[PDB]
C-alpha cells in the first residue's frame, strides 16, 4: 500500500531541476506495457517497444543491433548496467532503470547532461526497488 | 499485522563486541531493503547501517564512526536483519532500531550500554 | 554527505497556533526527505516522506513543503496529540543524515 501518488513522483523526484537543468519528460511504466505514470508531454508508447526492453533486461545486449525505440523514435543502445539500466542516445537521449515490477524512463535533452538523467532516474529506482516496486 | 521486533542488546564491557538482531513479520522481507537507526541515551537519532535486496546485490552501506568497525547482514529465508558490532566504545552506547526503507515501520529498540 | 541542519531547536505553542519546523540540507535532496514525530519512551512515526506525501492515518494539519535545500514542516491548529521530538532525514545518498530534532511543548 501506498498513499504516495506515482504522479507525485514524477513532478518532484524525476522533473526537479539539478544544476539548473531539467528533464524533457518522464513516466513510470510497468512491466506490463501499462504506464504507471507519466508527464505531459512525454511519448504515447506501444507494445512491442516495451516487449523490446524487457527483453534487454532478462538477456543484455539483444537491443543494441535493432535499437532502443520509444515512441516510434529510434535510439542507439548505450546500454550501462546490465539487466539494471539501459541508456539511448539519439543526438537528446534517454535512461530506463528496471525496478522489480516497473520502469522508470526519463528523456533528456541538451543542456542536460546524461549524467544527470541517469542519477535523477536510477535514485528513484533504487527507491522503489527497496520498497517492493 | 506488521511488527518489527529486535533482540541482543545489553551491556559490553570495552574493546568488546555485539550482534544485534531484527525478526521481521508482516511483510516480504526479500522485497524490502532494511536500516539500522542510533539513537544516543539523551541525544537524537544518527543513521548507521543499510543493506539493499537482493536484487540490487545486497550493497551494504555504512556511516564514517562505524564503518571500519560494524558489520551488517541478511537472511532472507529466516526472516531476519542482523548488526554486528566490533571495538565497542564509549560513543557507541545508543538505542538501536531497526527501520525498512524510509521509516514507515520501526521497531520498538535495544540498547547498548558500553561500561565496565 | 548530504548534512541536515534542524531548526527550532525547541518550540513552544498553544493549542490551535500554528508552527513550522524547517529543516535544510548540505545538498540537493530532490524531496527525498521523511518526517518523524517520536513521543517520549515510544518508536519515531511517519508523518510525511517524500517531502510533502502524508503517511497511512496523519492528520491533515502536518503539511509538507519545500523543494531543494529548503525544507519545512508545518503544523497549524496543533493538538494535544501533536507533542514530541520531531527529525528530518534525506534519503539522496548514503550517508542518509539527520537533524538535530524539534521538542515541541503543546502548551494546553
Known amino acids: 500500500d501506498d498513499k504516495m501518488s506515482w504522479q507525485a513522483y514524477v513532478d518532484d523526484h524525476l522533473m526537479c531541476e539539478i544544476e539548473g537543468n531539467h528533464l524533457s519528460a518522464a513516466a513510470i511504466i510497468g512491466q506490463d506495457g501499462s504506464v504507471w505514470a507519466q508527464s505531459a508531454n512525454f511519448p504515447q508508447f506501444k507494445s512491442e517497444e516495451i516487449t523490446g526492453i524487457m527483453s534487454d533486461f532478462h538477456e543484455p545486449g539483444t537491443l543494441a543491433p535493432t535499437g532502443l525505440y520509444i515512441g516510434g523514435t529510434k535510439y542507439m543502445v548505450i546500454q550501462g548496467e546490465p539487466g539494471a539500466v539501459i541508456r539511448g542516445k539519439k543526438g537528446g537521449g534517454v535512461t530506463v532503470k528496471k525496478t522489480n515490477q516497473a520502469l522508470i524512463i526519463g528523456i533528456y535533452d541538451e543542456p542536460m547532461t546524461p549524467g544527470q538523467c541517469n542519477m535523477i532516474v536510477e535514485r528513484l529506482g533504487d527507491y522503489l526497488i527497496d520498497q517492493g516496486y | 499485522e506488521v511488527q518489527l521486533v529486535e533482540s541482543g542488546g545489553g551491556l559490553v564491557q570495552p574493546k568488546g563486541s555485539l550482534k544485534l538482531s531484527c525478526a521481521a513479520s508482516?511483510?516480504?522481507?526479500?522485497?524490502?531493503?532494511m536500516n539500522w537507526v542510533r539513537q544516543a541515551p539523551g541525544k537524537g537519532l544518527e543513521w548507521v547501517a543499510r543493506?539493499?535486496?537482493?536484487?540490487?546485490?545486497?550493497?551494504?552501506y555504512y556511516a564514517d564512526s562505524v564503518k571500519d568497525r560494524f558489520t551488517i547482514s541478511r537472511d532472507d529465508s529466516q526472516s531476519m536483519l542482523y548488526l554486528q558490532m566490533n571495538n565497542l566504545k564509549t560513543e557507541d552506547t545508543a538505542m538501536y532500531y531497526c527501520?525498512?526503507?524510509?521509516?514507515?515501520?520501526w521497531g520498538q529498540g535495544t540498547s547498548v550500554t558500553v561500561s565496565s | 554527505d548530504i548534512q541536515m541542519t534542524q531548526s527550532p531547536a525547541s518550540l513552544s505553542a498553544s493549542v490551535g497556533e500554528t508552527v513550522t519546523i524547517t529543516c535544510r540540507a548540505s545538498?540537493?535532496?530532490?524531496?527525498?526527505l521523511a518526517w518523524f514525530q517520536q513521543k517520549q519512551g515510544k518508536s519515531p512515526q511517519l508523518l510525511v516522506y517524500?517531502?510533502?506525501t502524508l503517511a497511512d492515518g496523519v492528520p491533515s494539519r502536518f503539511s509538507g513543503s519545500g523543494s531543494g535545500t529548503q525544507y519545512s514542516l508545518k503544523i497549524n491548529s496543533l493538538q494535544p496529540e501533536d507533542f514530541g521530538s520531531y527529525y528530518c532525514?534525506?534519503?539522496?545518498?548514503?550517508?542518509?543524515?539527520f537533524g538535530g530534532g524539534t521538542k515541541l511543548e503543546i502548551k494546553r
Open positions: 532525514q534525506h534519503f539522496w545518498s548514503t550517508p542518509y543524515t
Open positions: 545538498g540537493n535532496i530532490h524531496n527525498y
Open positions: 527501520v525498512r526503507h524510509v521509516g514507515d515501520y
Open positions: 508482516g511483510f516480504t522481507f526479500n522485497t524490502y531493503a
Open positions: 517524500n517531502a510533502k
Open positions: 543493506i539493499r535486496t537482493k536484487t540490487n546485490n545486497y550493497v551494504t
